Amino acid sequence: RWTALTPEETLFIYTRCQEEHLPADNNSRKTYIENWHQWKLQPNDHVTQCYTKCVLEGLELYDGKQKKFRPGRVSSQHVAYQFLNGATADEVAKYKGAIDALEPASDSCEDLYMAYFPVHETFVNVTRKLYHGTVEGAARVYNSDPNLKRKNESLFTYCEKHVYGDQNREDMCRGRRYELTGSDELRNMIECVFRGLRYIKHGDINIDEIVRDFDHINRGDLEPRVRTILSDCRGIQPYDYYSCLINSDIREEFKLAFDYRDVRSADYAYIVKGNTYDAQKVIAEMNKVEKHVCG
Numbered sequence: 001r002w003t004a005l006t007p008e009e010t011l012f013i014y015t016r017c018q019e020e021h022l023p024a025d026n027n028s029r030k031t032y033i034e035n036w037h038q039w040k041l042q043p044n045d046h047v048t049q050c051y052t053k054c055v056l057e058g059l060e061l062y063d064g065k066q067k068k069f070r071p072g073r074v075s076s077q078h079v080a081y082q083f084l085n086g087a088t089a090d091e092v093a094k095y096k097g098a099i100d101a102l103e104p105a106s107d108s109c110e111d112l113y114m115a116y117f118p119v120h121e122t123f124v125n126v127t128r129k130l131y132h133g134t135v136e137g138a139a140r141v142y143n144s145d146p147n148l149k150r151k152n153e154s155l156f157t158y159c160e161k162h163v164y165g166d167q168n169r170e171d172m173c174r175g176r177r178y179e180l181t182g183s184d185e186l187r188n189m190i191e192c193v194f195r196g197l198r199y200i201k202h203g204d205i206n207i208d209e210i211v212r213d214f215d216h217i218n219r220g221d222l223e224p225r226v227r228t229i230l231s232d233c234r235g236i237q238p239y240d241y242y243s244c245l246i247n248s249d250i251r252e253e254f255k256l257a258f259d260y261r262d263v264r265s266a267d268y269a270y271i272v273k274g275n276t277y278d279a280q281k282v283i284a285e286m287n288k289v290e291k292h293v294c295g
C-alpha cells in the first residue's frame with residue numbers, strides 16, 4: 001500500500017525541485033520563483049517543464065518505474081487528511097478521473113508537461129489542498145499531528161527530542177560532538193537523521209544524497225572517495241555508514257557537510273531564498289546549540 005505524503009515530505013519535494021531546476025542567473029531565476037510560487041507553470045520552457053516533471057515525481061503522482069500516472073494515489077492522499085483537507089468528494093473524483101485519462105506518450109520533461117498541464121490548470125487548487133500546497137492547509141496538518149517535523153525546526157533537534165527525550169543528556173552531548181558512543185539511543189538517532197535527510201530510503205542507502213551534501217560545502221572533489229567508503233561499508237544500518245564516514249580520512253569534511261545540512265534542515269528553502277555556504281556562521285550556530293546541550 002502506498003502511504004500519503006506529509007507536509008514535511010511535500011515541502012521537501014517542492015524545495016528540492018526548485019533547488020534542482022531554478023537557473024543560477026539572477027534575472028532569470030526571479031521570474032521562475034515568482035511564477036512557481038503562485039503555482040503558475042510559466043513560462044513554458046525546458047526549465048519549467050523539468051521542474052514540473054520533478055514535482056510530479058516527488059509527489060509520486062507519476063511513477064518513474066512503471067512510467068505512468070498512478071491515479072489511485074490521489075485517493076490515498078485525500079483519505080489520509082480528508083477532514084483537515086478542505087477537499088470535496090466531487091473535486092477528488094474529477095481530479096482522479098482526469099489523471100486516470102493521462103498517458104503522456106513518454107517521460108521527458110516536455111511530454112509530461114504537455115500531458116499534465118491542462119489537468120494542472122483545471123485542478124491546481126485541488127492539488128494544493130491534497131498535497132499540502134498552501135501555508136494554511138499545511139499548518140492545519142502540522143497542528144493536528146505532533147510527530148511531524150516543523151518548517152523552522154532542525155531535523156537534528158527534532159530527532160533528539162524524539163530519541164533521547166530528557167534522558168541520557170550526557171550520551172546526547174557526546175553524540176552531538178560526533179562521538180561513536182555505540183549506544184542504542186545514538187543508533188536510533190542516526191537512523192532518524194538518515195531517514196529525514198533521505199540518506200536512506202526503504203532500507204537502501206542513498207549515496208547521491210550524501211555526495212550532494214559534500215558538493216554543498218565545495219568539496220565535490222571528494223565524491224569518488226565518498227562513494228568508495230559507502231560502497232565498501234559492510235553494514236546496512238544508518239549507524240554503519242555513519243561510522244564508516246566518521247572513521248575515515250574525510251571525517252572532518254563529513255562534519256562540515258553534516259553541520260551545513262543540519263542548518264539547511266531547519267529551513268527547507270534555504271538555497272531557494274539565495275543563502276550561501278558560510279562555514280563560520282554554520283559552526284557558530286552549531287556551537288550555540290552544543291553548548292546548550294552539553295550545558
Ligand SMILES: CCCCC[C@H](O)/C=C/[C@@H]1[C@@H](C/C=C\CCCC(=O)O)[C@H]2CO[C@@H]1C2
Nearest residue numbers: 014015036037039055132133134135138151
Ligand atoms: C504539479 C506541479 C506543481 C508546481 C509546484 C508548486 O510551484 C509548488 C511550490 C512550493 C509552494 C508550496 C506551498 C505551500 C506549502 C507550505 C509552505 C510553508 O510551510 O511555508 C511553496 C513552498 O515551496 C514552493 C513555494
Ligand SMILES: NCCc1c[nH]c2ccc(O)cc12
Nearest residue numbers: 156160172175176189259262
Ligand atoms: N550538527 C550535527 C549534529 C549531530 C551529528 N551527529 C549527532 C549525533 C547525535 C546528536 O544528538 C546530534 C548529532
